[PDB]
Short mmCIF file of C-alpha atoms in Angstrom, two decimals:
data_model
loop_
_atom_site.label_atom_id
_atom_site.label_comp_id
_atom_site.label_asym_id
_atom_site.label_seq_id
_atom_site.Cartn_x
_atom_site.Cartn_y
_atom_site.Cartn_z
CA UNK A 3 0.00 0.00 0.00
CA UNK A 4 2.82 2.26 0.12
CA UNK A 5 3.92 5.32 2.78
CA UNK A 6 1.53 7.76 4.30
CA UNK A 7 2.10 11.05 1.57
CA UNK A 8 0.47 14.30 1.30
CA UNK A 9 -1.72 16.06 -1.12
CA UNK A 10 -3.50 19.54 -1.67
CA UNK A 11 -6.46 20.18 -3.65
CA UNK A 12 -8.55 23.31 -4.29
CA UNK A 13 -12.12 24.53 -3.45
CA UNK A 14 -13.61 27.93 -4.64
CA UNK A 15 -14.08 29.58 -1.80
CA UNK A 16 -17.92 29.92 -2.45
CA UNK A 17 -18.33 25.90 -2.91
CA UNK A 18 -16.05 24.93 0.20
CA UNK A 19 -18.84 24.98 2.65
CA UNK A 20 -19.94 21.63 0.57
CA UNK A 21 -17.58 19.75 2.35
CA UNK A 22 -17.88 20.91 5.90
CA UNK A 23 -21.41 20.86 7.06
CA UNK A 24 -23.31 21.64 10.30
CA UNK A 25 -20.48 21.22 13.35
CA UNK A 26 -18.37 19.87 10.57
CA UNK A 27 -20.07 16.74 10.11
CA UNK A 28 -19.44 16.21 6.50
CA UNK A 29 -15.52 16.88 6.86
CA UNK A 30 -15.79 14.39 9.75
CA UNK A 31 -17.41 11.96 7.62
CA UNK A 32 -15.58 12.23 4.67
CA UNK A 33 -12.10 11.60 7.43
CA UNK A 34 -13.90 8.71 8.23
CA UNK A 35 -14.59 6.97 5.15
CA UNK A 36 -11.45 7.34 3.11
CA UNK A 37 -9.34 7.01 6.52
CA UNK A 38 -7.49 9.91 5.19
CA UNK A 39 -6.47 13.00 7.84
CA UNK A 40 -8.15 16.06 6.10
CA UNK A 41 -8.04 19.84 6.98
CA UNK A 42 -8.75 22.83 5.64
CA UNK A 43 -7.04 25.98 5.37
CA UNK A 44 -7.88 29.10 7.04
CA UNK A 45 -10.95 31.11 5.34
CA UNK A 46 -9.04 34.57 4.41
CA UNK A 47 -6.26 32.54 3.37
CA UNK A 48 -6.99 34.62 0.12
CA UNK A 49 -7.20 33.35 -3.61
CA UNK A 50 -10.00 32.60 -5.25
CA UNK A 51 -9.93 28.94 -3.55
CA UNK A 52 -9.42 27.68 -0.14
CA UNK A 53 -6.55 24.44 0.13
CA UNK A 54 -7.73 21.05 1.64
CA UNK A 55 -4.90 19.29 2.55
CA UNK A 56 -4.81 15.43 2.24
CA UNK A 57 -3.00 12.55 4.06
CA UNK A 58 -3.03 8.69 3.91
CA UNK A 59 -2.07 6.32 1.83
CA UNK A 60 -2.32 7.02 -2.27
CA UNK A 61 -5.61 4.88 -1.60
CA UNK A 62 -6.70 7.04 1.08
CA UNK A 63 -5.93 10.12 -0.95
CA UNK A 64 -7.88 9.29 -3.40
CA UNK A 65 -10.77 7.94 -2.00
CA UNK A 66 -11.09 11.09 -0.09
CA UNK A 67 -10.61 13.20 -3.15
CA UNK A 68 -14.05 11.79 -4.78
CA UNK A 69 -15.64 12.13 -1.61
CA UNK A 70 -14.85 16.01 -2.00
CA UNK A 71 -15.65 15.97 -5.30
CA UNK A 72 -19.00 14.30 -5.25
CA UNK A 73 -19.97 16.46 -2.00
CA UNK A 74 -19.29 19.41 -3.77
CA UNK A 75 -21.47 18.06 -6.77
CA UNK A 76 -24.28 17.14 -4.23
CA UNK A 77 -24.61 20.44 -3.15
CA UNK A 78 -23.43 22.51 -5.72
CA UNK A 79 -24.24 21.09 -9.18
CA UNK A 80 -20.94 20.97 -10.29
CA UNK A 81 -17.71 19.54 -9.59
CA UNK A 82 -14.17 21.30 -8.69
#
């Protein structure tokens, strides 16, 4: 399965709230299901986009990136 790594991705700052929910529970569930350590960046952090910042295994990574993704389609229409 390979070494725990590190990846970024970015959210427009007006779609981020897709992936955080009430008290955080989305973030918490998304965590939860790919196993992955996710946080997110602070909200003036500037740019057009906020940075979510991924860790885990490759596996991990990406099973929490199309968590994000689909969560952002679920509540957004559209992905990132």
């Amino acid at each position: 399965m390979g070494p725990i790594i590190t990846t970024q991705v970015t959210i427009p700052k007006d779609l981020a709230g897709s992936i955080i929910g009430k008290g955080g529970q989305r973030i918490k569930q998304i965590r939860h299901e790919s196993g992955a350590s996710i946080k997110i960046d602070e909200p003036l952090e500037g740019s057009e986009d906020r940075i979510i910042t991924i860790t885990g295994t490759q596996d991990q990574i990406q099973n929490a990136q199309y968590l994000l993704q689909n969560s952002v389609k679920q509540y957004s229409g559209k992905f990132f």
